Structures are given as C-alpha cells and as structure tokens.
Amino acid sequence: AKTRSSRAGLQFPVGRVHRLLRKGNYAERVGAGAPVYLAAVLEYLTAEILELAGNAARDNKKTRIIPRHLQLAVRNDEELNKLLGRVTIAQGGVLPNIQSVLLPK
Amino acid sequence: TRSSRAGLQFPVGRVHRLLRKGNYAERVGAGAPVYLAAVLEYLTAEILELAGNAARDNKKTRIIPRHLQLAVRNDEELNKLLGRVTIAQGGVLPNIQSVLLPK
Amino acid sequence: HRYRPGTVALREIRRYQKSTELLIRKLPFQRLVREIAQDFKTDLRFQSSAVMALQEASEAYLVALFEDTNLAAIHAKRVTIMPKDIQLARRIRGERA
Amino acid sequence: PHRYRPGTVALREIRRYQKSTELLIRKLPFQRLVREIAQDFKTDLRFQSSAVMALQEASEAYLVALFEDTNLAAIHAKRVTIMPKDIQLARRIRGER
Amino acid sequence: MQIFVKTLTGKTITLEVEPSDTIENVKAKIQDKEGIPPDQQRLIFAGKQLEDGRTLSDYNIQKESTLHLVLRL
Amino acid sequence: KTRKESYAIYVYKVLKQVHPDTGISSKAMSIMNSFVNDVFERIAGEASRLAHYNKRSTITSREIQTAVRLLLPGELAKHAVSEGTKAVTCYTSAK
Amino acid sequence: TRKESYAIYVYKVLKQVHPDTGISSKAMSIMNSFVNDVFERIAGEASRLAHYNKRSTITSREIQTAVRLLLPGELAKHAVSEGTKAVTCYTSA
Amino acid sequence: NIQGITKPAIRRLARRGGVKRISGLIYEETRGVLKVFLENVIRDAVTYTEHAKRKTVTAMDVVYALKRQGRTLYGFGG
Amino acid sequence: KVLRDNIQGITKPAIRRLARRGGVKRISGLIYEETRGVLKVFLENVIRDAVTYTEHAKRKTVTAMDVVYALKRQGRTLYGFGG
DNA sequence: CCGGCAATCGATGTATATATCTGACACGTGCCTGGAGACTAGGGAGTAATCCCCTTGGCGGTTAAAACGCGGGGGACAGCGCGTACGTGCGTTTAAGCGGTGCTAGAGCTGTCTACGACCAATTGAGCGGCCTCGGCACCGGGATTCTGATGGGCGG
DNA sequence: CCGCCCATCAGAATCCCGGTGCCGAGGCCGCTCAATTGGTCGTAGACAGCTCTAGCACCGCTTAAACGCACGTACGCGCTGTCCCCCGCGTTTTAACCGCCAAGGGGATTACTCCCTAGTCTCCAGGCACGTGTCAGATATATACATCGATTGCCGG
C-alpha cells in the first residue's frame, strides 16, 4: 500500500483530488478524509451512469457508447434526471414521445 | 481614511477586509475595494431615491418595506436584477386583467 | 339589497392587492410545520422567526402560482380557474415532470 | 394517383426526427447570422469552429424545448395547431421577458 | 438636443448642445451655467475620459445621454 | 453581547444625502442590509471565477469591472462603471 | 504542454462495470465535464457550510452534509454508504 | 392539520393573486402543492440545523435553505 | 464586410424540422417570424456574454470556452465542448 | 335498392441481411513532474462548566372568523355549420457542401526585471452597545363622496 | 303591443378629517478593537521577441434542398341552448388571539490542552505525449415485411 487510492481501495485518484481541493480557494485547511470521501462519491456516480449507458448501448446491438446512449440513460432515470435537470448533452437528441391526442383514431 | 481619499460614504477598509477573509483569491489589489464600494453606494442610492419618491407619494415621512417593493417592481432594470428575490411584508403590484372587468 | 355576482369578488381583489398582511392563521400553520418537521427528526424546537419566514415564503410562492394559473385559465377562454390550469402552470415552470 | 391524407406524413416526420441526432439547420447561414450579430458589440472579431458548433447546439436545444412547451399550451386550449399566443404564454410562464 | 451632467453632490444639470459641438464648447457652456473653471473639470462617459479636441458625435453621445463630471483640484 | 456589524450607518448617510428629510424603519433597514450583502457576494464570486479562468492569483479592478458588466443589466452597468472609474481615479490622485 | 483529465479512471470504472463495451471520444468528453461539474458543486457547498459555522477547515462532515444537500433521495443514501466505507477502509489501513 | 388551511384563506390568497372565479376542486390541489413545498424546505433546514449540532431550528437555517432552492428572502437577517 | 438580411437564412423548412423534433403536428403560418425573433434575442444575450469574456482576456478570437462559460452563466450547462 | 361496416390489394416506406473498406479506438514506450515518506512546529478544534434566556405548556375569556344552508343567475360545455388556411405533391432554381490553394494575423511560449502586495509593530479614532426623549403614526368617531343596482320611462320592430 | 335600451333614485362602501395617545426612531456618551502608517522583502505579472498554426478568402462542380404553385379537406371559430354550480347573504359555532404565569432545557461564552495540518526535503513511479496496428461501423445493394388508403362485397334499413 503506497498510494492513497490503494489504501482506500478506489480507482479515482486521492492525491489529485486533494491537490485540486487545496488550490481551488475553498477553505484555509483540508482534512485527511475529505479527498477519500469525495473520490468515493465521484466513483459511485460514474459507475451508475456508465452501467445505465452500457445497458442502453447493448439494447441497440452496439459495442461502443456514444452520446446518444448517455442521453437515453440519463433521461430515463428519475434521480439522474433531477440531478442533471438543467444540462444539455451535445449530440444527444430527445426521448421519443408523442401526445395521445395527435394519434389517429 | 481611504473612504475620505476616494470621497465615498461606504467603508473601504471593511470591504478590503471582507475580500481578504472571504476565500476569493490569494491576493487582493489596492483599487478593488474602492471600485466595489463605489458600485455598492451607487446601487444603494438608486434604490433609496426610488423608495423615497414612493414614500412621499403616500404622504408618509418614513420608508417601509411596501415602498421598497413598489420602487423595485416598477423599474425594469431593478426588476431584472432582483428577479428571484422575495421582500418580506412587501405585497404585490395592483393588476387586474381587462377580461375580468365588467362590461 | 343584493349585489350581482362578480362585484364583491372585484372588491376583494382590490382590497387584498393593496394590503401587506399575512392571509393565513398562525396557529394552524405552526401545527402543520411542526408535524411536517417531526418526520425528518423528532424532539425538535423552532424559533418564532423561523415560522414567520416559512409563512412568508410559502405565501409568496402560492400567490405567484395563482397568477400563473389565472393566465393559463384566460388562455383557454375562461374566467374560472381549474386544477388543469395549475397542472399546466407547474409543468411549464419545471416543478412537475 | 397515390396520395396520403393530411397528418400522416407529419407523424412519420415526428418519428423520424425524434430518433436521429444531427443538426437541423444549415451551417453557413447560422455562421453568417452569428457573425452579423457579433458585429454589433465589437468589429473585426474571429471565431473558432468549435464556438459556432457550441452556439448551434445550444440554440437547437433551446428551440426544441420551447416548442414542446408550446405544444402543451396549444393542447390545453383544445387545439392541435400551434399559434403565436401559445409561444407567448409559454415564454411568459417560464419567466422569460 | 439635450444631455444631463451629474456632479458628486448629486446635482443633475441639463445642457443644450449639438452633436458637432466639441468637448471644449460643452465645457465652456458648463462654466457659463455653473462657474466651474476649465482646468478642473474631467468628463466621464461609458468609462472613458473625454478629450477637449474631440466632438460629441465622436463618442456616440446621443440625445438624453448622461455624463459624470469630476472636479480635479 | 458580542459586537455585531452591519451597513446601517452608511445607508442612513446615503439616504440623508438623497432625501434630506426622510426616515427609515427597522424592517426596511434589514432589507437594505440583506440587499447590500447579496450584491457583494454576487460580484465577488463572479470576479473570483474570472481570476480563476485566466490563471491569476490576484483580484484587481479589472476583474471587478468585468464582473459588474456581466452581472448588471442595461444602463445600470454603464453608470456603475462610470462611478467606479471616477472613484478609483480620485483615490489614485489623492495620497 | 501536459493536459490532465479523468479519462483513465473513467475507463477503469467502465471496464470494471461492463468488461466488453468500449467508449468513443465525445462520450469521454461528456463524462469529463460531468465529473468536473459534480466536483465543483460539492466543493462549493462544503465551503459555504464551513463558512456558516465559523470554521477554517473542510472535513468529511462537510462533504457528507454537502452530498446530503445536493444529491436527490435514493442517490444520497448509497453515496453516503460508499463514502463512509471508503473512509473506514482508509483509516484501518 | 393540513385541513387547518381553510377554504377562505385559499380564497384570500387567490384574491391577492387576481382571481375572480374559483372552481370547487382547487383547494385540495392547493393543499397538496403547499405540503410538497413545505416538505422540501423543512428537509433542507433540518439538515442545516443538524450539521451545527443544535436542537433548535433558527431563521438562518430557513434563509439558507430557501437560498439553496433558488428563492432569496430579504428582511430576516440574510 | 458588413452583412444583413441573414435572419432569413433560417428557412421555413428548418423551423418545421425543429417543430417535428418537438412533437408538433400542425403549424400556423405566423410561427416562423416569432421563432426568428426568439432566436435573435437568445443569440444576442449569449454572444454579448461571450464577447465580454473574450475581451477580458485581451484576445481577438472567440473560443469555445467563452461560449461554455457564458452558457453556464445564463444557467444552461453544456457537456461535450470541453470544460 | 342504397349506407355503413368490414374484408381485400396495390403502392410505398422502413427495417434486415450481406460484402467492403476505412478511420478511430485500443495498446506499447520514455521521461518528467507531481505524489508519497519522514519530521517538526503551532494553532484550531474538542471538552468541560456556567448562566440565563427563550421556548414550551397551561389557563381564562371575547369576539371575530369559519361553517352551513339557501336561492338564483351566469358561465361552462356540447352540438352544428361554414369557410378558409394548411398539408401533400410536383416541377424548377439555387446555393450549400466538398475539395483544394494560399496567406497571414495571432495565440502560445520564454526570459527578465520591477513594481506591487504581504507581513509586522505601534497608535488611535470610528463604530457599537446602552439610555432617553419626543414626534410620526396608529386608533376611534364622524361626515362626504362614490359606485351599484332597482325603478321608472321611452322607443322601435 | 311588448321586449330592448336609457335616465334617475336610495343605499352600502371607501375615504378624508380631527382629536388622542403611545411606542419606536433619532440623538448622545464611553470604550475597545480594527483600520492606519511606516518599513522590508519576495514574486506575480507586464513586456519584448519568436514560432507556427489555424482562421479567412477565393475558385470550381454537384446535387440535394429550397421555392413557387395548385388542389382539396379538415380544423378553427362563431352561434345557440341548457343545466348546474359557484356567488352573495344570513345564522350559529368555534377556536384563534391576547394576556398571564411558571419551569427548565439548551444556546452562548470561557478556559485548557493536544493532536491534526501545513511546510520542507528527498526520491521515484504513474500518467501523458507520441506512434502503430486492426476491427466496429458506415456505405452500397438487394430484399422482405408492415402500413395505409382506394375498392368492393355483405347485413341491414
């Protein structure tokens, strides 16, 4: 155990997050566990979005993920939709939706 | 004092201290507090002028939050600036849709 | 005598658009606030100023919502406001998904 | 002579354009319009291609959302045609001056 | 066409000048109507200090515009 | 009884400069205090972000001017910029 | 000049979640922007929290309260669990 | 206790909003929307209170929560 | 070179395509002029902010970072063009 | 013996299967810059103890608001008719898009040196808390003015 | 001759005036702590110079998209009738609001300590720029299936 990420068992960097915290003009001092907490949270959110996007990509018989799959993943989940409410994803598109009145009878 | 040198009413030293102990940047220049104090005093004077006119309209000698609300809501620039702000004990502007009025 | 319908309504519109008082009784609002807060955490206390601020914010929110509802009702060639107008206003504003 | 009834090709186009992701505006006219607009604030300016691309993406997203709100407002008034008053109502309720 | 000059004392005065009028002429009018000497007045418009040799049309000062007067001692 | 600071005296001085015979109540004073604090925070945050973008360690009058231009709309920005420039010039001239 | 980014860590997370899919170049840019945005939001809220209570340090309590304030209902619980587990593991080792 | 928000109070709020005629089903909707708004604000305020290790909710917590939601409120110490 | 008339380059079929992506079936004939006005207002605001950002940095070229910063300032975040 | 309803059938649009190639994604290498290990010094934050202030809980009364009922007029909704504006299609015209070519303005990097901001110490006056006093504003009673709706009247189909 | 439009009355409703009182705003005094002045030092940033890159301008050719015109239909808008449901008013109930009293919990301050974080130096390895191979996906072609709208047959009035 040499790096801090290995000690915490993460994939995201702890030292880089600590450096960004210390130079972003946020507070006079930064505690030891704050980078660990922040890195864990960021890794969790990334994992959630990537899992949903990968399922969407598989639904289309595709291998690689494109911004369309990210847009489909975000817009179909309530929590992610609330979080990314005022965000525009480039080359994303829209969810297919037609009002019931316009359909033929 | 620095306000006397700049010919202002608002405090320059206090603004400088607030800038330095607010975690905004590593260093703060000499003219930034002067500029900021001047701008703040100008905005205060504008709002107070409008509110005082509103207070005089109602035959009153003291300004109350209703007068501040009337001053802010009747000016386009101030309404744009304070667009998402609620003033306590302020009220609303009188406005009735023309469709609801009797024929 | 008797006033025709719609007159006293306009009188109340004029009267309440000029005052600045609070339009909801204080004890019911206090009770509602306490029972709402008891879900997130029990054994809690409130300053009087906290309840006053809550009442002011909620009243302003409701008044603005009713203004938008009246606009939506007028758009549909009506003078009566209906729940669908509230739903349309909330949906367009962004609160309702 | 084969001919479709009104409203069929409209639904087909709705289905087509809600499934793709390309830009729906020609690039040269938009570039010219952006340069003309920017000429008011400061002359002899230059633009990266990425700047114009980002501007186009933002504009298209804004217009699409506005049209969705306009469609909702039009349906609220028991109609299928969108009209300028629907655009005005949506913009007013959204808070845009 | 008419413009408004603001002083540090909150006093706003009205001036009747022309688009082709130079800043020196505007100044001369301000002394005539207020008694303030030529050397002491500094004019600020849109964050820029005006030059006596320039005209009002040079700085795009339109009708009912406002300029801030600075006294230099 | 810990000392608590505010902007009351300066607001009253400005008011007496504008309307020589006019008072103010306590609630209006609270509202004015909140307004001044809010505008201060907005301008300071915008200037700090501007300094961060261009890789600078100092906040200068240029950052304040650009923040005022970005935040204040219309003629408010013009008049505020003129006032700030005049104040800075007067401060520099005097010593 | 060297330019740093989150690409490698995002790719490692993806290979851990879906070990067969890939990612394109624009999706990587979107993910980078997302990570930066969330980082800035949480850090700003934590700094404001520390300023309110007259403290000169940022600890894990500020981060926990920040993620409780920002993240919606069901995301917050799992995020808090992950952060607490990571901090406990770091302290133990 | 949501029924303590009586129908005449809602009518007075509507009058201040400029509404002339009111349907009979508006009061239930108004109660629901008010409850949702209060729940959000009170949740945020209680979180702010618990971070400070206090057992009393102050006006500062309410002001901070409202500012977080995007509704600044003047006149209570902001 | 100063150019005008360029708002008419946003043709009627393009606005129709945008409406189709918006889910609209029938369009009145007066929608296009108002759409042009709305687009003009939006572009004016964003471009003003971007130019302010550019001139603070003493540059003669508008970059994508300035556009992203302006859009974030107006409360419209955009993912993909850096940031 | 036609009308409405339901079952065909041709045209058309869209999804599916099969090479083909190509530009983009995934992997391999050097180095250099930032992160980790070890140690020291100091101040920020935790902990304990006091105090007194504000919040909670209970009691009595009074009176103003709320709840309930009734009668009626106006508005909401459904149905019908008309006419015009918008959708679908076709032939013609235009400019967007692609592919090169050249040129130059300007963005980005590097070295220097200097003025500007931080830090430290002593001093002193501006601003905050506490106390008083009086005048602007709230309250009550009375008169004046203003709409508003019923009543009488006049008129034209 | 009678339904529709117009002028005129009393009656609540809001407002203005005058007298009374009373509580909050404006002013004054003492102290303390934060802003001012003077001096020293280090580095952040302005300035000059050079390099190369990407943004701008011009030309030629294709062809797909835009534009103009015609025809028909289906949707929007206006009118009419009804039916019921909100509004205005009167009576009875209830509980909010005000005043008063009492107790105790917890918020705010102070003193002390210790341990967690910053700062310094050394060392080394992880991540970024660069370069290369190959395969996932876009393209072109052929084909099968679903859908829509006109045609026609059948039960029924």
Residue numbers in the entry:
A (entry chain G): 14 to 118
B (entry chain C): 16 to 118
C (entry chain E): 39 to 135
D (entry chain A): 38 to 134
E (entry chain K): 1 to 73
F (entry chain D): 28 to 122
G (entry chain H): 29 to 121
H (entry chain F): 25 to 102
Show sentences the authors wrote.
The nucleosome is the fundamental organizational unit of chromatin and comprises two copies each of histones H2A, H2B, H3, and H4 wrapped by ∼147 base pairs (bp) of DNA. The nucleosome contains a conserved cluster of negatively charged residues in histones H2A and H2B, known as the nucleosome acidic patch, that is a hotspot for interactions with proteins that regulate transcription, the cell cycle, and the DNA damage response. Monoubiquitination of histones H2B-K120 (H2BK120ub) and H2A-K119 (H2AK119ub) play opposing roles in transcription regulation and chromatin compaction. Our results suggest a mechanism by which H2BK120ub serves as a gatekeeper to the acidic patch and point to distinct roles for histone H2AK119 and H2BK120 ubiquitination in regulating protein binding to nucleosomes.
